[PDB]
Design a binder for these strands. Structure first.
Length: 71
RNA sequence: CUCGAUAACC
RNA sequence: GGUUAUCGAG
């Protein structure tokens, strides 16, 4: 519920462009499923897939992003 | 608010 | 033509 921003903030602290998000929507329009990939510093990071709304997609990808940034 | 579905029933 | 309910989206 808070990664999307931690990263946005990383973008500031390092001048970098604001995170581009990418939604893979797929399934019955009601049982829609989402996967996401952030592309910060033109670098792709994949969310764990099958989220039920867009945001939980983005968050998974942000939460992932930051996982590799601590490194 | 609008648009995209699905189940159900008359 | 409806209706009740249920979900996602800008």
């Amino acid at each position: 519920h808070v990664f999307k921003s931690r990263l946005q903030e990383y973008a500031q602290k390092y001048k970098l462009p604001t995170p581009v998000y990418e939604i893979v929507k797929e399934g019955p329009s009601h049982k829609s499923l989402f996967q996401s990939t952030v592309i910060l510093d033109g670098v792709r990071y994949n969310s764990l897939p099958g989220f039920f709304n867009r945001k939980a997609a983005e968050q998974s990808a942000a939460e992932v992003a930051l996982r590799e940034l601590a490194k």
